């Protein structure tokens, strides 16, 4: 029934654009409202350790790291909290590493528990480094500060997905953890095949299993294709799990909006997450 | 090479 209003609403009634740019507007209100500040971001202490001058983690979500803190480590790394339906946090939007921030990568990994990272941009893209490697080739392992990070196998889950199994150890500790790798999603767009996305979702959950560590989600900035990946897979589990009767696809947008900044980019993925939804509630 | 969005 739910599912099935919603798709009656959405055919009741292509724009949309009048939607996103309300979505754009709550943005710059909580900001001038300073219920979404980026103090934490701007320190010069920490301005290096991001991507873009544009991009700054929110104070009220962000990851906040305490692993290696009596050495004297930062709490410091440009990702935010999203929570999950159950109210959980559900996921970790982060930049992709810059090559001095590796290890405070790994520190996040290993201080949450994560099993599944999920990337979706490439190391290069416009002729330019978009993302460090920070992964391991089987051929050589990646060492920062006390992690040591190991290739076991790679495979692919389908033809834009690559599926690494990764070992990590760190202080005579052990863990596996796998990333997903999507290879042709550029910035500000959309996937090469939205059933290809779907899939990399799947398999993200069936690798996470039972578990209530976040699952980490990352493209260059950690904004726009971050923020479809965690709205694409949070209303999957409000179908599997829960959809409200007066369920609101601007409200999700803007409940991700307000622990990740550009959270969902562009007009253009809004569109996507739309067309994405309603496919998704016809099976 | 600096900016990303807004």
């Known amino acids: ?283 | 090479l600096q900016r990303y969005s807004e």
Not at chain 1, 65 to 76: A, F, K, M, R, T
Not at chain 1, 93 to 110: C, E, K, N, S, Y
Not at chain 1, 183 to 208: F, I, K, N, T, Y
Request: hydrophobic share 40%; charged share 25%; aromatic share 10%.
């Open chain 1, 1 to 283: 029934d739910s599912a099935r209003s919603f798709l009656e609403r959405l055919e009741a009634r292509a724009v949309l654009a009048g939607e996103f740019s309300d979505i754009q507007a709550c943005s710059a209100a909580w900001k001038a409202d300073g219920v979404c500040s980026t103090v934490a971001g701007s320190r010069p202490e920490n301005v290096r350790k991001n991507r873009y001058k544009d991009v700054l983690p929110y104070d009220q979500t962000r990851v906040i790291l305490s692993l290696l803190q009596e050495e004297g480590h930062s709490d410091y790394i440009n990702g935010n909290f999203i929570r999950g339906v159950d109210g959980s946090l559900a996921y970790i939007a982060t930049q992709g590493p810059l090559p001095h921030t590796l290890l405070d990568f790994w520190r996040l990994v290993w201080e949450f528990g994560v099993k599944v990272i999920l990337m979706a941009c490439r190391e290069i893209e416009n002729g330019r480094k978009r993302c460090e490697r920070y992964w391991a080739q089987e051929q050589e392992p990646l060492q920062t500060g006390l992690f040591c990070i190991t290739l076991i196998k790679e495979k692919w889950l389908n033809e834009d997905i690559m599926l690494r199994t990764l070992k990590v150890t760190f202080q005579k500790e052990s863990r596996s953890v796998y990333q997903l790798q999507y290879m042709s999603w550029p910035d500000r767009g959309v996937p090469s095949s939205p059933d290809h996305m779907l899939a990399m979702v799947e398999e993200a959950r069936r690798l996470q299993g039972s578990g209530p560590e976040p699952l980490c989600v990352h493209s260059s900035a950690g904004c726009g294709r971050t923020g479809v990946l965690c709205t694409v897979d949070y209303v999957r589990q409000l179908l599997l799990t829960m959809i409200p009767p007066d369920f609101s696809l601007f409200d999700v947008v803007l409940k991700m909006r307000k622990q990740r900044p550009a959270a969902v980019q562009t007009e253009e993925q809004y569109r996507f997450l739309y067309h994405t939804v309603a496919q998704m509630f016809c099976s």
